[PDB]
Paper text:
Plasma kallikrein (pKal) proteolytically cleaves high molecular weight kininogen to generate the potent vasodilator and the pro-inflammatory peptide, bradykinin. pKal activity is tightly regulated in healthy individuals by the serpin C1-inhibitor, but individuals with hereditary angioedema (HAE) are deficient in C1-inhibitor and consequently exhibit excessive bradykinin generation that in turn causes debilitating and potentially fatal swelling attacks. To develop a potential therapeutic agent for HAE and other pKal-mediated disorders, we used phage display to discover a fully human IgG1 monoclonal antibody (DX-2930) against pKal. In vitro experiments demonstrated that DX-2930 potently inhibits active pKal (Ki = 0.120 ± 0.005 nm) but does not target either the zymogen (prekallikrein) or any other serine protease tested. Here, we describe the discovery and biochemical characterization of DX-2930, including the x-ray structure of the Fab·pKal complex, which provides a rationale for the specificity and effectiveness of DX-2930.
To understand the interaction between DX-2930 and pKal with atomic resolution, we crystallized the Fab portion of DX-2930 both alone and in a complex with a deglycosylated variant of the human pKal catalytic domain. However, DX-2930 heavy chain CDR loops do not have resolvable density in the apo structure. Although not directly involved in pKal interactions, the CDR3 residues 99RRIG, Asp-107, and 109FDI that were also included in the affinity maturation rounds make Fab intramolecular contacts that stabilize the CDR3 loop conformation and also likely contribute to the overall folding stability of the Fab.
Numbering used by the authors:
A (entry chain H): 2 to 26, 31 to 52, 55 to 101, 106 to 223
B (entry chain L): 1 to 212
Write the structure that this text describes.
Amino acid sequence: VQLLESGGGLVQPGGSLRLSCAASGHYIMMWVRQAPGKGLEWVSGIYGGITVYADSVKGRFTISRDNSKNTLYLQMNSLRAEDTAVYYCAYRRIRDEFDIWGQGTMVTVSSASTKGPSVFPLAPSSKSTSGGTAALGCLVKDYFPEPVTVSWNSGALTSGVHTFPAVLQSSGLYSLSSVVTVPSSSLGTQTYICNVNHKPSNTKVDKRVEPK
Amino acid sequence: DIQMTQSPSTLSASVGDRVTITCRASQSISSWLAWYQQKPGKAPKLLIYKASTLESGVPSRFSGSGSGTEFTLTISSLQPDDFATYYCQQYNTYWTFGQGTKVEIKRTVAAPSVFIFPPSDEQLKSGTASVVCLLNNFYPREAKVQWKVDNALQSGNSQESVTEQDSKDSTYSLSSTLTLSKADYEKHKVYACEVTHQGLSSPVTKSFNRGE
Ligand SMILES: [Cl-]
């Protein structure tokens, strides 16, 4: 068995999408979703063609199947920010496998447009210098959509580097910082440059982070 | 209406340890309980169904026990592949998932090194000020960050982000970002980040004076 999912994408609030999950190779079929940072959430099922819904989506989503196409659908109307999630389909036996899961399709509900990040220095100073070690970094702010990547010194500095998971701001744009700890002794010797790439906007930025 | 609650929410363990996760139902679900494993970025994988039946191809170190309202997943000897998040699911009435239990790698206590970064003059020209507080390479994950602006405690104007456990040293790092308009930022002098953590015998504060 394989389940092939599609139909996920970016849509503005109030918009609609139709997800598909096509089987290859008795049933109960489910849709289950996972918002960023959150747990699994069952949202709809079809078992006669009996259909059921979670309270969170009832009245907005509709589950159906086309037996001739071996394909399960989820029609999603009146979408909201909180519907942003990865949507999985799962087939449950009613092979020796009890479950078959799809790989997921991403749904993003937002009116933001593609936008490259700002890149601001996080300069080392006495306020970021503890016992021979200094911290420095770059703040990669106000981009859409995910993802960005950050390197240091074009990949030459990897030790001590932490690039944080993005947060969604109330503006609807993403932000993250990337930081590195180095010897405070290296601050006048060695140069530190963050290399930021945001493929969706064709943005590639190099920023030198100079010590105070 | 069937609520599923797991305990603990996070468990810290070592390779070779025997580990137990509990799942409770708000009303009896008889033996209609499944356990899942999920890794970051991936569809969940079924481990156990009908409370105690091992799914095809799942390692024999996983086992499930219990019935009615109380269930247990046991991993007899933990392996590196097993650090992950685990979800129970009731399927008495539709599907409902528990909130997840994260199994992470135990190590010694390590206090965070704390660093504060004022906003760049460069950003201030944007009309916004981001003040960044970094907590680096600490364990365990639980920590508290308070922002204080001229000794006044702040709320609702910050966002946190945390890394996944480091693959070499098993620590976490955390960023907290305070965001203010330029005008609001210019009203105050002293900006401080106060950090509480098990490894610190008292809270650590890093601070600066705007412009100094
Ligand atoms: Cl659920």
